[PDB]
Amino acid sequence: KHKILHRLLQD
Amino acid sequence: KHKILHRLLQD
Amino acid sequence: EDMPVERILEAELAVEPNDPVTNICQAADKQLFTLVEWAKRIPHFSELPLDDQVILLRAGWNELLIASFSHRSIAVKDGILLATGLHVHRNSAHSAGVGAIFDRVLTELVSKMRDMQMDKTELGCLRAIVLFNPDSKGLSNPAEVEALREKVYASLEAYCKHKYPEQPGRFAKLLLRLPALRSIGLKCLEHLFFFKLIGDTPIDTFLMEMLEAP
Amino acid sequence: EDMPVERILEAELAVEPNDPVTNICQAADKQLFTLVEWAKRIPHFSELPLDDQVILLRAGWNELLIASFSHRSIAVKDGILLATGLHVHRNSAHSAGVGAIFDRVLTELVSKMRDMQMDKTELGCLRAIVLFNPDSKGLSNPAEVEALREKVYASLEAYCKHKYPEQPGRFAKLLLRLPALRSIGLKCLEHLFFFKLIGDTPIDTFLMEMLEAP
Ligand SMILES: CC(=C/C=C/C(C)=C/C(=O)O)/C=C1\CCCC(C2CC2)=C1CCC(C)C
Ligand SMILES: CC(=C/C=C/C(C)=C/C(=O)O)/C=C1\CCCC(C2CC2)=C1CCC(C)C
């Protein structure tokens, strides 16, 4: 869950 | 409206 | 300009020396009468016009009562002590379907008050700040209420730093429990309105009056 | 211990140089991407475990965005300036059925920020305090988040008093807008969930993700 947020925080 | 509160504050 | 913490502490000491939901609602009604006596003892509250005194209490009663039973329960393990002398255990609240909000009170309020050892003077000042809520709609003179609020937190800060010089962030820590109190206060009202709608769960006259519109 | 207001101000300046509801929801989605970039610029946020970074942003995004568009609108008469460059006038909000919450934002947030001339550093610190919310459920290490919050308000107070020595109650006044922000934040979420339920009113992917459970 929360695909977008994780991707943005990691990058 | 608010009968109880008024009575208590006034007394 | 005339808002001594001593008077606020006195106000606190003056008013306070099987469905758990029903017991909670009964304690709430009982405490509403006591809340009026408490407010009257807060410096300058009684000098405000009657209509504004009504607005302030209707706007803050739920947060004011929650702050009080939360602080009262600091000595309690996993439960809350009601004004009626009854204790509600975490397990009891959970088994009644109100475990979520109960846990928020224990975690966000009680545990935090216990951890920082919030004292009665500080509790009293925080409630006085909540009472003097300048954002309350309908106030005839909001600036006046805001002025009283400012005098309360000015006195509270002086009290802190003098009483707890070694804890410079204490004053801020106290004010920072207000957002939690506001959120919990709103959730508790939602529960009350649902109980009133569903019927069952007796709701006494003063508590019921607070649920009146607005 | 390492939380300079200068870095917080930089974070603020770095991210920000016919149904009004649809425009508001579009601006919200757009700003969520920018919010992530803002947070990454807040000292120590990125050092927290990824799971806690997610929890903190999911818990505070609505309040964080509201604080931002509210401060941005201090120059606006009776309206709000959206990040998309669009303006929503009080009359427009009212004619769309969202006048009540709109008025709360103007009265409880915008007007108050304007009246005390809240500056960007203060705004940045208040948002950093909201970001570092130790009450967020699921946090792997709440004490760590609480420590960061404490460092932020310690720095904020130092900034005030040094910048505004003649206003001793300024620091408290800033923290005292947080309860209002919390209440308004909750009401805005209620509106969003209703819009999602009713359908209509397009809701983009990031905004939609924030509405996911929990
Ligand atoms: C608004 C209010 C007031 C509590 C007053 C008391 C109990 C004062 C006292 O004794 O000193 C609290 C309520 C209301 C209905 C909804 C719920 C909860 C759904 C039961 C609670 C209780 C709040 C905590 C204990 C969980
Ligand atoms: C949660 C949120 C976020 C706003 C983000 C923006 C618009 C950022 C920006 O541009 O800089 C705000 C919402 C959500 C849906 C419910 C309503 C309101 C029912 C429309 C509002 C807008 C809040 C004020 C303007 C009234």
Question: Distance between CA atoms of D184 and D186, rounded to whole angstroms?
Answer: 5
Q: Please report how the helices D178-198 and D20-40 are oriented relative to each other, as an axis angle in degrees rounded to 10.
A: 130
Please state how this structure was obtained: X-ray
**Alpha carbon distance, N-terminus to C-terminus of chain B:** 17
DSSP state, residue D88: E
Whether residue D153 and residue C168 make contact (CB cut-off 8 A), yes or no, is no
What span, in angstroms and rounded, lies between the C-alpha atoms of C94 and C58? 29
Q: Is D104 exposed, middle or buried (0-12, 13-18, 19+ CB in 10 A)?
A: middle
Q: Is the CB of D191 under 6 A from ligand 2?
A: yes
What is the domain-level CATH number for residue D63? 1.10.565.10
Query: Cα dihedral angle (C40, D182, D162, D112), rounded to 10 degrees?
Result: -70
Q: Which of C115, C125, C135 to mutate to test the interface with D (most CBs of D within 10 A)?
A: C135
Instruction: State both tokens at D144.
Output: 């760590």
For residue D65, the enclosing domain spans 1-214
- Which residues of C are less than 8 Å from D186 in CB distance? 183, 186
- Contact status, residue C43 vs residue C9, Cβ threshold 8 Å: no
Read off φ and ψ for residue C81, nearest 5 degrees: -95, 115
Contact C22, C99 (CB under 8 A): no
Contacts of D54 (CB under 8 A, 6+ apart): A2, A5, A6, A9
Ligand 1 contacts CB of residue C121 (under 6 A): no
The tally of domains found in chain C comes to 1
Chain B contact present for C209, CB below 8 A: yes
State the angle between helix axes of C142-162 and C5-15 in degrees (0 to 180), rounded to the nearest 10.
90
Contacts of C95 (CB under 8 A, 6+ apart): none
| D90: number of Cβ within 10 Å | 17
Residue D85, number of CB atoms within 10 A of its CB: 7
* Contact residues on chain D for A10, CB-CB shorter than 8 A: 50
D149 labeled part of a ligand binding site: no
Dihedral (Cα; D57, D60, D66, D71), 10-degree rounding: -80
Q: Which of A1, A5, A6 to mutate to test the interface with D (most CBs of D within 10 A)?
A: A5
Task: For chain C, give the DSSP string.
Answer: ----HHHHHHHHHHH----HHHHHHHHHHHHHHHHHHHHHTSTTGGGS-HHHHHHHHHHHHHHHHHHHHHHHTTTSSSEEE-TTS-EEEHHHHHHTT-HHHHHHIIIIIIHHHHHHT--HHHHHHHHHHHHS-TT-TT-S-HHHHHHHHHHHHHHHHHHHHHSSTT-TTHHHHHHTTHHHHHHHHHHHHHHHHHHHHH--S---HHHHHHTS--
How buried is D116 (Cβ within 10 angstroms: 0-12 exposed, 13-18 middle, 19+ buried)? middle
